[PDB]
Amino acid sequence: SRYSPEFKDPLIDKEYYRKPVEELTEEEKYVRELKKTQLIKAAPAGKTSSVFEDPVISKFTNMMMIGGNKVLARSLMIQTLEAVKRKQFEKYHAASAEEQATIERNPYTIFHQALKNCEPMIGLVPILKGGRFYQVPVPLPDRRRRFLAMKWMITECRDKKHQRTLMPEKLSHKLLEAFHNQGPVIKRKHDLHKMAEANRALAHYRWW
Amino acid sequence: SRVLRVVLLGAPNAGKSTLSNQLLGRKVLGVITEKETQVILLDTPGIEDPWKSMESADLVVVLVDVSDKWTRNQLSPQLLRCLTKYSQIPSVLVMNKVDCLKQKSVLLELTAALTEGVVNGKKLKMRQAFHPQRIGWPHFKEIFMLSALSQEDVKTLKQYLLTQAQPGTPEEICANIIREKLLEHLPQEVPYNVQQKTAVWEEGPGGELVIQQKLLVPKESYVKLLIGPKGHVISQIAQEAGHDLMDIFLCDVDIRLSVKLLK
Numbered sequence: 001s002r003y004s005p006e007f008k009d010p011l012i013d014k015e016y017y018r019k020p021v022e023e024l025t026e027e028e029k030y031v032r033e034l035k036k037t038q039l040i041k042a043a044p045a046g047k048t049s050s051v052f053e054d055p056v057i058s059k060f061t062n063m064m065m066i067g068g069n070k071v072l073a074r075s076l077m078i079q080t081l082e083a084v085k086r087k088q089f090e091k092y093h094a095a096s097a098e099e100q101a102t103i104e105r106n107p108y109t110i111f112h113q114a115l116k117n118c119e120p121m122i123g124l125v126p127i128l129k130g131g132r133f134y135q136v137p138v139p140l141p142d143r144r145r146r147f148l149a150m151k152w153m154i155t156e157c158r159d160k161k162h163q164r165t166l167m168p169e170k171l172s173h174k175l176l177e178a179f180h181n182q183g184p185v186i187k188r189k190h191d192l193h194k195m196a197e198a199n200r201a202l203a204h205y206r207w208w
Numbered sequence: 209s210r211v212l213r214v215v216l217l218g219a220p221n222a223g224k225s226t227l228s229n230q231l232l233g234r235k236v237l238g239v240i241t242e243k244e245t246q247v248i249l250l251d252t253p254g255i256e257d258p259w260k261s262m263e264s265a266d267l268v269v270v271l272v273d274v275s276d277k278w279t280r281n282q283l284s285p286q287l288l289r290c291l292t293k294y295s296q297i298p299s300v301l302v303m304n305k306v307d308c309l310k311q312k313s314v315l316l317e318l319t320a321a322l323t324e325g326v327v328n329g330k331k332l333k334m335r336q337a338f339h340p341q342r343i344g345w346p347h348f349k350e351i352f353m354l355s356a357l358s359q360e361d362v363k364t365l366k367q368y369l370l371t372q373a374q375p376g377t378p379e380e381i382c383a384n385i386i387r388e389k390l391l392e393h394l395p396q397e398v399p400y401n402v403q404q405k406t407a408v409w410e411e412g413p414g415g416e417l418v419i420q421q422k423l424l425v426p427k428e429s430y431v432k433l434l435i436g437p438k439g440h441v442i443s444q445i446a447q448e449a450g451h452d453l454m455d456i457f458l459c460d461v462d463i464r465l466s467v468k469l470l471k
Contacts, residue, residue: 127316129313132334134316134334201319202351204353204361205315
């Protein structure tokens, strides 16, 4: 690393600095006074104080890049968002009066709910002894299941069975399927939840 | 109202009484009442009483002391006979004293040995790198790994037992507390040779409970061990005992212990 150990990661949150000094508790006030003596790393290219910033979509875009091509990955992400938006507008226009109240048209809400519907709660962690890597059920951390939802969505969309259908079109279709609790990613979550129910012998090993 | 009868079976020093005390919440048949569930713990001696207790068992808790290298690898033949005759009753495995293990991965192998690779009617499918007297029991419904002394994971067993519920004198207390302290502090057979006789049991002028107990022993060496260096041991015992009594009777207790030789 080119940064010395004393350098600290920056805090890009903008409303954080606008809190009145009155609200600040003694601990938060001490933290703020401490921050003045430290060196702060340069903010990396990426996150910004923008109001449209979305860390989940940023992480999904980073997980889609191939070979450092961020422009293409962001282009694909925005194309997918626009495709979801246009599909929802088409479905809203053609719907009758009482079905227009239950049709979501915000693509960010759909993306977040689709990824949430695919998160697994429990997974299997192998453990080594005797030459047998013992598969014990484990409650997945939040970060782990968040990563797994995104990875399953991307791997599902990268399948070679989908011939010449462009990535934004596949991804919007999969996202709208997962929004309604349907599709192969939801089944991949279910086939892990049942296959971890099939191995509840070693369900109490709490020291993975 | 839901009811469960749980029979605890295991080796003599498997900690059955320890788990019963921790699960009851007091160091005491036991009854646990929580909301609409009642659990009746039947603590049996280690291996007629176990069989008679298991006659009325809704669930069986089979203990294995994993720290004991001699018996951790197999169930006792008498125990295996006992489950076989009562195969209809559900059974659960409890691996106790996990804290004493250097290498926790050991329990993995022991599970395969103790459950014969089968639990709750399910199989274990485990590949490897590259590539008669029964020893275990294949009809365990569940497996728990816990330590009785440290209360580690005991709560999980408590909740499991609760969920498994199906449709359906003061002087003695003082003597028991003193005996507990004697057992904890004294070595070898000494605490088993101490006879307790109450000298004074009254209410003092300030409302406290004045207690004077006489500890009678047959040997002078037992007297020396009881008194300890400079009277420390006995004093500690008394002090600790008093504290427990102060909680039991919800009143101030002035407890005085005296040691005398049995003539």
